[PDB]
Amino acid sequence: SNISRQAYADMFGPTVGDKVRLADTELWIEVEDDLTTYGEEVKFGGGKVIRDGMGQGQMLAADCVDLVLTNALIVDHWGIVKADIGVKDGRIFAIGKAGNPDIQPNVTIPIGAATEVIAAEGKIVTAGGIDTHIHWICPQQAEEALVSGVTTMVGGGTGPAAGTHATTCTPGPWYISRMLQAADSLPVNIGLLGKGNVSQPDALREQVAAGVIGLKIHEDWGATPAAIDCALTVADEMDIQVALHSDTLNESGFVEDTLAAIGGRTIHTFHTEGAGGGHAPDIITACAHPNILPSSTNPTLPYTLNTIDEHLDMLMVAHHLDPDIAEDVAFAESRIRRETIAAEDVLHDLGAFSLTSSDSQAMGRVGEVILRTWQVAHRMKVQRGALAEETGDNDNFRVKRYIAKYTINPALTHGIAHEVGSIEVGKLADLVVWSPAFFGVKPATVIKGGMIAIAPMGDINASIPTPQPVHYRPMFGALGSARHHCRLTFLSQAAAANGVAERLNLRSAIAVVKGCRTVQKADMVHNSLQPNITVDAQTYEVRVDGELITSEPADVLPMAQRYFLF
Amino acid sequence: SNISRQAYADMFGPTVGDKVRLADTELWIEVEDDLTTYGEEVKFGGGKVIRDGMGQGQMLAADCVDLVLTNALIVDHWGIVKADIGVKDGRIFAIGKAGNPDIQPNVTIPIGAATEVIAAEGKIVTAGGIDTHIHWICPQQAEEALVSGVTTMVGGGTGPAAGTHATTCTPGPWYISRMLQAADSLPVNIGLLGKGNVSQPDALREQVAAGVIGLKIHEDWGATPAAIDCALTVADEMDIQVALHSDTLNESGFVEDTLAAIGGRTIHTFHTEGAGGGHAPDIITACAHPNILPSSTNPTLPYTLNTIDEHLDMLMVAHHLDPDIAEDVAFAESRIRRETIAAEDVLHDLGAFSLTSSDSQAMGRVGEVILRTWQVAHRMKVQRGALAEETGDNDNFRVKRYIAKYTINPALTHGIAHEVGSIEVGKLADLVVWSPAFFGVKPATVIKGGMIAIAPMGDINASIPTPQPVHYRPMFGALGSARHHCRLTFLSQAAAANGVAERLNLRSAIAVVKGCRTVQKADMVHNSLQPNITVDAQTYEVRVDGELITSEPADVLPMAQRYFLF
Amino acid sequence: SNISRQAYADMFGPTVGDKVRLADTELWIEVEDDLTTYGEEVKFGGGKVIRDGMGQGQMLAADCVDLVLTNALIVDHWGIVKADIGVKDGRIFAIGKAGNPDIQPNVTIPIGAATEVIAAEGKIVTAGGIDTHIHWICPQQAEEALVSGVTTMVGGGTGPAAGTHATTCTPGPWYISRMLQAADSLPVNIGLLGKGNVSQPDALREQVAAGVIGLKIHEDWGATPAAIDCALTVADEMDIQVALHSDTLNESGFVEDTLAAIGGRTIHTFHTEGAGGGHAPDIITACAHPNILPSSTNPTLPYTLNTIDEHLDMLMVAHHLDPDIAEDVAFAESRIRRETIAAEDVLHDLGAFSLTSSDSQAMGRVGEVILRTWQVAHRMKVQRGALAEETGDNDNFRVKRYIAKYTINPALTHGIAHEVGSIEVGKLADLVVWSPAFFGVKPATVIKGGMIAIAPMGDINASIPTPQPVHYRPMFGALGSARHHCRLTFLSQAAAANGVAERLNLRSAIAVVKGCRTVQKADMVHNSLQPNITVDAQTYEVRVDGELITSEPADVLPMAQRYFLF
Amino acid sequence: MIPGEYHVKPGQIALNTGRATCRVVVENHGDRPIQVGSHYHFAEVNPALKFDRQQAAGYRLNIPAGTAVRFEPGQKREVELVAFAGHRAVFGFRGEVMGPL
Amino acid sequence: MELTPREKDKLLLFTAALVAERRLARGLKLNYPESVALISAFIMEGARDGKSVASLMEEGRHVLTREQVMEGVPEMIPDIQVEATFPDGSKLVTVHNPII
Amino acid sequence: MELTPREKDKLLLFTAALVAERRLARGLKLNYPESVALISAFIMEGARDGKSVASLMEEGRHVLTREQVMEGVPEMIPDIQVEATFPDGSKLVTVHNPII
Ligand code: NI
Ligand code: NI
Ligand code: NI
Ligand code: NI
Ligand code: NI
Ligand code: NI
């Protein structure tokens, strides 16, 4: 028959042409395409469509999906479309039209007796986030990140030890082995970074052979040209990634010396703006090079009225600096610059910075990577208007550019894009379901490897799952053996071949990293800009092609006081 | 010598002829028998009886029990007696007289060096409850149920997904395998139900071969005559049970059509009253048939002043119904009838309804199965007086009839009575110890497979275990490998033979279901009544042999505000 | 160059000659030695010493330590010295000077790429405590003890059962096996005690062969001369320890009869003062014998104004005594004597009592073993002044005498000193880091087997680990497989040989007890006094060589209201 | 209404019926109190208690299970004993019998 | 006290409501979590008092008005649900559009 | 703050007592858990004030009377026990038959 568009939206979620506001921001997305056949949408419930002989078929388990997310509004780097999502064997099976081929047309996702259903009508579905700057200071960080919508965590550490407080390093074979074993207990995908600060190659090869998927070069352990060259040489031969936190003190040379030491080899630069560490005051100029994959840590995102004030003492505690030692306070201050902090936000909007990360409990907030990325997008739309790439009266392109920062780009940078990072067929089914009013703030459901791992849950003894108090609680996907089956522990190719998983008796599924040396700035999705950027040594002013890059500090931000109890 | 009866009761608990009030209800039980020899009772403590050469013997571990519950007042379907309970190898060894044969007479339960002691004098001991209507919406339900005194949970689900929110189904091999693995982490015995709504037999056989011990036919997935017939055919060949939630909409036929489709084959009818689902308004007439094992879900037990008011919105959320869609609200209302809700309570008192269950977080309260069963017994005694079967001035028979509803009957219905369900020799030692003042509300100790799994525990740092705050905390029986050894995962005969436990690497003890097809109404302990029941299509009045069946709504109930903080 | 002593202390912690106050007590320790080379101290952080080519060398993992605790002030039975501590393979590698041999002098602890760093400057480091009087009433006790600084727990129990409430016994093979399996889930080293009260040797041998490292003789199970002799005979042949709680009732004989039954064989006497159990009123005279290793439980330590008042009801609940039964209250009162309670504190100061323990939730506080030991030391210094052994103007000797009470002495007594008990090379790296202001009260870091297992942790989502709320949370060393690798399950030599670990499939590292029969009073470090002690049968007055031993009750104690919220 | 209250029927319970008993005068000659449990083999109690140990052979106190009789120093009193049953085998205590009788 | 998991869970709701209560007292416009906690806690006390489910379904819509909460909050709360022990046992109270 | 497990556990008792305190203030007759929490919290504060164990064992019997609690409650509480940090360390306070 016929149905009005509003009534339609209320039943199956929005369709082509409808716009949706992201949380309480000024960002609006417009449905670009709808893969359904009007009248044939599948809906589950009492007397609905997904029933025997109707929307559900007679096929065996092998010929139908294990899980279907009905009427989902997908937001990913490749599009903002309405469709059903099929999951089979813990992986994304298809994005299309679900149902029963026996009576329905255009069915690409068959529903059978073996199919579970998640109703996504009126919800937005995205890939799980990937934070590549984790300091394993405590295991509790995993639950915090998962609750925020982050399903993969890459970093290093051994617990609350001085070395880990300051750096993302899991030092040596013994600690690496121990942390790989501990990883089986966490409900997120994990990859570890070893200590890359050494001028003896074999000391690095041992760590890679033990299991790390990357090496962290940190100034606290000595970010010298010799150490940098050594780490990159080993990375080039073992196909692992190097993450850099450069020499802030300019002790061994200036930024140009470090860049020269890198010698055009692929490298991921952490907190490229500089506040989190790096050559003062021009480490930000690294984003101009083709071999540099630049990311930001989150406390400087976005530039607000209280940003500068909170930074000094945060800096001190994170790096074990003494406020009574003049040289210690002088170097802390040289890292905090209003000029570079303001420019960073614009560089993200332009696609010059390609990733966002946390820097968990070491000058960063583990549960705020996604939230802050969207706050930057909002502040940039408000200040700069539409991007040159925008088409139509929506912010679709800006949304695709920003979501790529914590999903596909971190995956490409670390050689794990073959497993996770986006909603594409064949990738692990790490999905996050959001209600539009809470997009980027509080998820409705977090799926790991095809099983729900955490979600808001009301009174356990209640007659329904909705009564108060409603707070996040671990689900079956986070329990024992089910967890092992739904998570991945990433290993280096060498470790995988050496039988490290068998030796340590790792229980989780194993994935190997690859393609860490071949990625370059041009490969970052929607964020491949290489600007002719300069920093004034005296004023710290950032300029691109001579024009001054800057922005204004926010007094109030969306995704803040309206959602949190504290 | 001689001792007064009161002083005796204070030291060893009540004996033959003494009566005890169950919590704050009007139900009184009278000790029917005492298996002790007066003067030879065993008591543990400083300078007591259980000591070397005295109440404790010289036998090796093989010749004595591992655990003895001294001076217990047993309440079970077969009797209300005073006796010692011996547990050996995680199973009930004997019910009799404990002690040392070297110096004591009539010892049937030998106590030796290898014997632990639980003092049950002044306490009531019962079998662990069995809830056969679980929606695995979240893992937290297991702790809630265990704390209430329920040690076995049968149901289906995959977590907080739409399909599970509405139905007790774990769809297909992948999800079934995943949930069987997750089950090892839970401190209760578990058996899973698959999705039985299909007209292709092989799609059902796959699920049974994967591990489910039953199949749920639910109207939300299409409770049609074809689907029903298919599920029953497979059940008949694989010795598994079928649980039914019929076609409320009368879409494929009326109740007589569904009954015809069942064709005299054994089937467990969920929430037979109808509010939780089923042919409107006469699904309750199913309790008249010999092949129907009928149960109630708990929100309608017992009929109270606030019952009707809370049901509409509960119904809506549980079945994903839209309150704006007229047809959705009309079918919700046709399920809520004061007439059938009031009659249900009486039918339980008469033994026409044989089981009580929860319907956890899908129109039911997981921690209130036991509590509500006793509230019904209380309300029925208050309204109808003594049962025709009562002997003596006590409520012993009514108590045996009601305890059978959440213990032995659910066990028989699901083919697990050979392992659990009652305090009989050879059965798993799942026992619950209660203080009379808190009977059915808050247990003193919950034992799983011979080990205490959860119990109230005071200040951990205190000088004794009693100081405040006292709240339920997991014990050793709920920890890692000890848990695996003290719990059971029930599998179908086919799954057991296929080596599913080995393939999934299940760690817990395995038990197989059997005898699901041969049980009938006549086999339900103390609840085998098949009344000539009718429901008026217009008025909804329930009549048995022409007489109107009804009851009055309670304004206040026992086991309520006197015990709970909220 | 030159640096002032105060500035030096602020940067690297105190050095030779400097004194430090222990928490808020009157005890002061003086650094006896410093193993560093002034100017060559290693410090980690931004621009510090531990960096590539500088304080960190080029050696492979095999030639450097996994962890180094820099500038630690060690307090152990052998000395109070300043030094770096190296940990390799989960064990103490060396105590000396850390750094890089390439550019630094006197380096005995090489730091390389594989080395993690814990900054201990300004902190005190001690061995993990060892509580040998644990009642396994609930698993939560393990976290409580670990948080207090206790890393090894020896005791018995099966959970909140009457037998365990009263005694430290894990009765028989079945329960022993179950508890050994449950132990893998706890973050502390564990050894179990079986029920030693039997006059049939084989019933004891079975328990030892099943896994217990000792046998508890308890009066509640009959502490008769026959049972005592039997347990000691088996202990002598299987190299396990016997713990005694004698016949308070003097039912089978007086203290001299029990001592005669022991017949000079090695035995550990629990709560030797008597309040926790034992021949009334002279069990305390046992500390005069060479074969008796005497310990105190903690509620009587130290003697305070509220001590007596709280004891009666504590006694009753712990032993299942009836306050209405005259004989029960009379025997409870005969155990509580102001005279012996006051003398106990002095006997500890003199080295006549060699160990402190808790008696967890059975007349003892699991989280207060360390705390109360120091409160006694404080009260004794205040009342008696300096010990005859003191040298210099400090309390170094008294501190060494008292720390030995909950570290090395319990280890020697139970045959586990080859694995734990002190900071010596080759022993398991169970270390506790303390800030001087919180010494003995709230640890800064608790290390188990080379990994941090628990520590205070602030806001998980914070930019640093310090923001409020800060409370103790489990770390990686307490997680799954990492935990198994960092903890030890102690077994008897017989169990180890029988393949018990393989049979039960224990996952943790295994250690075997040995040397339980050869230890004597003369072997207790700094606590080997055998005084000619007498107790007046009528007045209960304790005298040593005729002189009256006594002390005054404290009205206020340090390590109390200044640190706790409740 | 009292939750979980008992309704104990009035009367008395006769303990250890149909078994041999005997009375014995016991005196504590020790300087410390001695308390004996209901099931302890009386003939093997603390040596300081003076009585006809020969008469008490195979006997225990005829008192309710779990209770005891206390003897303060110098206290003299007459107690009633009841014979052991079962196999009448005594093991433990002071190790005086360790076998049947 | 023998507090079950559900009783302890409700203590979390009670405490969250104390936070909101103090902020409302200062004259602040309540946010999303504060509003849900305040209204929920109100209902739980109503049940303790012995009020009927029907009465609470109505009274619950008069705890907070649109002028006492932040913009958008009323629309973020289409309904509030909470269970409590009424004199006749546990019952569910559903308050539709509590803030107007 | 470095709160240990026991300190956090006591926060649960304190909060449970806040619930009871407000209900008693409304004039309701307290139930079993509310009564135990109220009296327990009272003792903990007594210890913080520096009162002796002996004084509290007595004072604790005068916090609630039989007319302020529901029927049967006094009989469900033969005694109350709680530990707290007194000036002289942790001590146990046992109050027999607290409600009369
Ligand atoms: Ni950095
Ligand atoms: Ni970092
Ligand atoms: Ni149903
Ligand atoms: Ni259901
Ligand atoms: Ni003892
Ligand atoms: Ni003890």
From Swiss-Prot, chains A, B, C:
Residues annotated as binding substrate: H218
Catalyzed reactions per annotation: urea + 2 H2O + H(+) = hydrogencarbonate + 2 NH4(+)
Record note on cofactor: Binds 2 nickel ions per subunit.
EC id: 3.5.1.5
Keywords: Cytoplasm, Hydrolase, Metal-binding, Nickel
One CC-aspect GO term: cytoplasm
Database matches in Pfam families: Amidohydro_1, Urease_alpha
Residues binding Ni(2+) 2, per UniProt: K216, H245, H271
GO BP term (any one): urea catabolic process
Result after altering H319A: Reduces activity 100000-fold, but increases KM only 3-fold; optimum pH is 6.75. Resistant to inactivation by diethylpyrocarbonate and iodoacetamide
pH dependence statement: Optimum pH is 7.75.
Domain Urease: 128-566
Primary site of residence: cytoplasm
Consequence of substituting H218 to N/Q: Increases KM 100-fold; optimum pH is 6
UniProt-listed SUPFAM superfamilies: Composite domain of metallo-dependent hydrolases, Metallo-dependent hydrolases
Pathway note: Nitrogen metabolism; urea degradation; CO(2) and NH(3) from urea (urease route): step 1/1
CDD domains linked: Urease_alpha
Alphabetized GO MF terms: nickel cation binding; urease activity
Similarity annotation: Belongs to the metallo-dependent hydrolases superfamily. Urease alpha subunit family.
NCBIfam families: PRK13206.1 (NF009685), PRK13207.1 (NF009686), urease_alph (TIGR01792)
Protein name: Urease subunit alpha
Gene field: ureC
Curated annotation (Swiss-Prot), chain D:
CDD domains (UniProt xref): Urease_beta (cd00407)
Annotated metabolic or biological route of this protein: Nitrogen metabolism; urea degradation; CO(2) and NH(3) from urea (urease route): step 1/1
Pfam family, one: Urease_beta
Class of the enzyme per the UniProt entry, highest EC level: hydrolase
Annotated phenotype, changing H39A: Reduces activity by 20% and reduces thermal stability above 50 degrees Celsius
InterPro entries: Urease_beta-like, Urease_betasu_sf, Urease_subunit
E.C. no: 3.5.1.5
A biological process term (GO) from this entry: urea catabolic process
GO cellular component: urease complex
Reactions accelerated catalytically: urea + 2 H2O + H(+) = hydrogencarbonate + 2 NH4(+)
Quaternary data: Heterotrimer of UreA (gamma), UreB (beta) and UreC (alpha) subunits. Three heterotrimers associate to form the active enzyme. The apoenzyme interacts with an accessory complex composed of UreD, UreF and UreG, which is required for the assembly of the nickel containing metallocenter of UreC. The UreE protein may also play a direct role as a metallochaperone in nickel transfer to the urease apoprotein.
UniProt similarity note: Belongs to the urease beta subunit family.
Protein name in the entry: Urease subunit beta
Swiss-Prot record, chains E, F:
GO molecular function: nickel cation binding; urease activity
Enzyme Commission code(s) on record: 3.5.1.5
InterPro entries found in the cross-reference section: Urease_gamma, Urease_gamma/gamma-beta_su, Urease_gamma_sf, Urease_subunit
Domain of life: Bacteria
Record's catalysed reaction(s): urea + 2 H2O + H(+) = hydrogencarbonate + 2 NH4(+)
pH dependence remark: Optimum pH is 7.75.
GO annotation (BP), single: urea catabolic process
Activity control summary: The apoenzyme can be activated in vitro in the presence of nickel ions and carbon dioxide, which promotes carbamylation of 'Lys-217' of the UreC (alpha) subunit.
Cell location: Cytoplasm
Alphabetical keyword list: Cytoplasm, Hydrolase
Gene Ontology terms: cellular component: cytoplasm
Family: Belongs to the urease gamma subunit family.
Assembly: Heterotrimer of UreA (gamma), UreB (beta) and UreC (alpha) subunits. Three heterotrimers associate to form the active enzyme. The apoenzyme interacts with an accessory complex composed of UreD, UreF and UreG, which is required for the assembly of the nickel containing metallocenter of UreC. The UreE protein may also play a direct role as a metallochaperone in nickel transfer to the urease apoprotein.
Name of the protein: Urease subunit gamma
Lineage: Bacteria, Pseudomonadati, Pseudomonadota, Gammaproteobacteria, Enterobacterales
